[PDB]
């Protein structure tokens with residue numbers, strides 16, 4: 124470690140601890156920056172040399188963490204918890220958490236290489252027939268093909284190509300990750316991930332949320348399954364069984380908005396998918412980002428700085444080099460550089476993703492002057508919620524009309540059902556997936572799911588929660604969990620479930636603050652400076668204060684709560700119950716063992 128980055132002398136008391144934290148931040152920004160920069164260089168240009176550089180950067184970060192972590196303990200271990208300044212206690216708490224820096228050098232090196240190799244494998248996997256990439260090729264097929272055999276080819280090809288080679292690395296990763304956090308005093312990595320919510324009852328609280336949300340999912344599921352049955356036939360759809368996992372518009376069946384055009388309740392009302400209009404009007408990625416930015420500035424939040432536009436990667440590179448296409452937002456910890464990396468496509472769901480990512484950037488812009496350790500969301504679900512809240516306003520037919528993407532719509536009950544149904548495909552269908560992913564990972568980390576049951580337990584959960592089944596046979600050679608970005612890229616997932624509940628609490632609160640008095644799902648907070656001020660107060664707090672308190676100030680309640688989401692969807696929740704009863708649907712999938720057969724002459728789809 125460079126001398127200028129090493130910790131020096133400080134007194135073993137609170138006053139000294141303040142000075143230690145100031146000294147820490149000065150050097151941490153340099154170390155974090157070099158690490159984020161090397162990660163950027165790799166993820167926008169995947170090569171063995173860039174992985175090597177990233178790995179060296181990670182090693183330096185680990186050296187730094189260890190030196191400052193050990194010094195924190197040397198001076199403050201018995202006293203930091205009784206410090207007067209709550210922000211100081213939080214800073215010291217973070218600094219003393221070493222993570223992978225607890226690993227000896229040889230194991231740090233294995234750990235860092237595993238992360239590189241898992242990232243490479245996922246982001247460069249291809250499906251050959253001249254081969255298709257996940258983004259854009261397989262993504263467009265899953266979104267827009269209504270050919271059972273083509274969808275199957277893409278679903279099978281992707282899961283085989285990405286998942287199988289990841290399995291041995293993922294096992295090695297898991298063991299090292301656990302070894303590292305065990306030395307911070309956590310029984311496994313999952314306990315550490317969960318500790319960020321600062322709640323002894325986290326898992327029970329989640330379960331009780333999902334219990335309230337499940338009926339909305341069951342009804343949406345049954346209604347969609349009926350439509351698929353009419354399209355694909357009794358051979359491939361079982362009206363009392365799980366839906367085949369390739370038919371829902373998304374590689375992971377995690378959100379279903381891309382099959383809206385197959386299930387639209389009232390086809391004679393306005394077309395709520397504005398993708399065609401975007402293309403007809405000549406929208407490009409840059410326009411999509413500018414229109415999102417303008418919504419932020421309408422709220423008197425910050426524009427994107429010049430460094431964002433100059434540094435970001437907003438379209439897939441045409442030199443055809445290898446990149447991580449999965450959308451992400453980047454804080455370089457120098458208070459200057461902030462960037463999005465997205466292989467942007469010109470679609471409505473991508474306009475929402477643009478807002479999701481820019482929500483992350485706005486958080487970074489608002490908390491950039493807090494101590495480095497506090498530059499995080501109040502909890503990670505908050506970070507994921509910000510942009511989605513704005514996107515809820517944007518997606519309203521009234522808002523789409525204002526920005527030229529939809530001829531004005533009537534405000535009749537059919538149009539309302541169409542809209543709420545399209546929104547349910549995006550938000551309600553996700554809920555089970557958002558909840559199950561980290562249930563699988565927590566079980567893997569805890570040892571309840573060994574390698575011998577990775578796929579068995581993954582499909583147990585996928586069926587249990589989503590009511591889906593693999594459309595070709597799978598066995599334990601397959602590692603279907605590895606075919607989802609967040610698994611090989613070690614990004615926790617429960618955040619997204621928390622976010623999907625939390626964003627409706629936020630939405631309600633900001634709509635009320637904007638003085639809006641109509642139905643919650645027709646609220647648009649555009650140009651509400653009062654709403655903007657209320658959101659800003661959250662963003663500026665970072666992780667300086669307990670999230671329960673930040674939430675309380677914002678929404679008047681100190682807990683996650685499903686009622687705002689239930690209120691938003693009420694009309695379509697009722698409509699779907701009634702529709703399914705009229706059709707005599709079974710809610711659920713009691714034929715839990717059912718899987719579809721292979722099509723005739725599959726895979727001869729020349």
Ligand SMILES: *[C@@H]1O[C@H](CO[C@H]2O[C@@H](C)[C@@H](O)[C@@H](O)[C@@H]2O)[C@@H](O[C@@H]2O[C@H](CO)[C@@H](O[C@@H]3O[C@H](CO)[C@@H](O)[C@H](O)[C@@H]3O)[C@H](O)[C@H]2NC(C)=O)[C@H](O)[C@H]1NC(C)=O
Pocket residue numbers: 521534640641642645
């Ligand atoms: C689409 O229409 C709905 C329904 O409007 C009905 O009620 C009014 C507006 C009347 O013109 C009638 O013909 C319509 O059928 C609009 O939703 C309603 O919005 C009004 C506010 O404009 C709400 O009134 C307010 O609600 C609460 C009651 O708790 C109070 O805080 C307020 O003082 C006020 O009473 C009303 O509740 C809404 N009705 C329903 C069924 O939700 C909606 O605004 C409109 N949307 C658009 C985009 O035009």
Ligand SMILES: *[C@@H]1O[C@H](CO)[C@@H](O[C@@H]2O[C@H](CO)[C@@H](O)[C@H](O)[C@H]2NC(C)=O)[C@H](O)[C@H]1NC(C)=O
Pocket residue numbers: 168170171172173
């Ligand atoms: C992608 O990364 C590679 C490294 O793997 C970059 O290669 C360097 O390119 C520079 C600039 O032209 C050359 O001068 C160096 O000699 C190259 N280094 C190596 C090790 O080959 C490449 O430039 C990157 N591409 C982009 C667009 O950034």
Ligand SMILES: *[C@@H]1O[C@H](CO[C@@H]2O[C@@H](C)[C@@H](O)[C@@H](O)[C@@H]2O)[C@@H](O)[C@H](O)[C@H]1NC(C)=O
Pocket residue numbers: 596597598599600
């Ligand atoms: C696991 O499955 C492997 C390949 O999948 C199989 O063959 C495909 C084409 C389908 O027909 C499907 O029924 C099968 O699952 C097999 O090569 C392999 O033998 C199986 N693995 C183990 C460990 O038994």
Ligand SMILES: [Cl-]
Pocket residue numbers: 316503504615616617618
């Ligand atoms: Cl999380």
Ligand SMILES: [Zn+2]
Pocket residue numbers: 479480483506507
């Ligand atoms: Zn996000």
